[PDB]
From a paper:
The MSMEG_4306 gene in Mycobacterium smegmatis encodes a protein of unknown function, and its homologue Rv2229c in M. tuberculosis has been shown to be essential for survival. Amino-acid sequence analysis of MSMEG_4306 does not indicate statistically significant similarity to any protein of known function.
Since the two homologues are likely to be too distantly related for successful molecular replacement, we decided to solve the structure of MSMEG_4306 by experimental phasing. Here, we report the crystal structure of MSMEG_4306 initially determined by zinc SAD phasing at 2.8 Å resolution and subsequently extended to 2.6 Å resolution. The structure of MSMEG_4306 was solved by zinc SAD phasing using the CRANK2 pipeline as implemented in CCP4. CRANK2 was able to locate one zinc ion and built a partial model for MSMEG_4306 with five fragments totalling 227 residues and identified the space group as P3121. The partial model thus obtained was further refined using REFMAC5 and phenix.refine, and the model was built manually using Coot.
Numbering used by the authors: 1 to 85, 92 to 239
């Protein structure tokens, strides 16, 4: 097989454009901005998990102060209902009121302990809300930089796509087809002959085949014996 040397040089640039598009696709899946957004999202979920755990403890303490204040109201109402006054049975109410006054005091002790504990946890929850709010703000900053990097990679991809479309139209389709058949093997399809090493698979070509490669004409097309990529000189 043979092909004009002018289009063989176009095939070399064509293999260069394909390599650049490969790095663009690789960069789109390995962005540094995406890694930054992954970190901020992780620790934002950390505070969201701690905020949810604090909400459970606050619900439990809210249920305690609701049960405490309700039982004191029953003792307070019983003290006020019995406050409205038989003198023989009056002493019977005096001994009960003293025992109920001891119950209202003992209940107020437990109520102040859980009110302090609720006041401490509401401050901790307030400290985590400030923390997750600051994390969320720069999370959107990382999200705008992640999206801004994707539109730059896509813009550079479209420009290399237009350059690739122009090169294929300038080469005989019989040569472009062989380049695609070699890429279907996983190789680079076309690479330069750098000294004695292939520019694609990076092998060291033996002295035997290389003696025949240097003897081929300019219009001739040659491939690497190990990978098959079209060697260009
Ligand atoms: Zn090769």
């Amino acid at each position: 097989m043979k092909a004009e040397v002018s289009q063989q040089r176009s095939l070399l640039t064509l293999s260069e454009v394909d390599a650049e598009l490969a790095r663009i696709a690789h960069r789109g899946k390995n962005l540094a901005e995406q890694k930054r957004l992954d970190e901020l999202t992780a620790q934002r979920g950390e505070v969201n998990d701690r905020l949810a755990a604090l909400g459970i403890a606050l619900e439990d303490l809210d249920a305690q102060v609701a049960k405490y204040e309700s039982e004191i109201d029953s003792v307070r109402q019983r003290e006020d209902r019995d406050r409205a006054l038989g003198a023989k049975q009056v002493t019977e109410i005096q001994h009960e009121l003293e025992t109920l006054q001891r119950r209202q005091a003992s209940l107020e002790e437990q109520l102040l302990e859980v009110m302090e504990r609720r006041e401490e946890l509401m401050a901790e929850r307030s400290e985590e809300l400030r923390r997750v709010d600051e994390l969320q703000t720069e999370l959107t900053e990382a999200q705008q930089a992640r999206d801004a990097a994707l539109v730059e990679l896509d813009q550079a991809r479209h420009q290399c796509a237009t350059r690739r479309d122009a090169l294929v139209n300038a080469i005989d389709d019989q040569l472009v087809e062989l380049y695609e058949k070699q890429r279907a093997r996983g190789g680079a399809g076309a690479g330069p002959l750098q000294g004695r090493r292939c520019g694609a698979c990076r092998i060291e070509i033996d002295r035997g085949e290389i003696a025949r490669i240097t003897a081929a004409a300019d219009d001739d097309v040659v491939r690497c014996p190990e990978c098959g990529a079209i060697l260009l000189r």
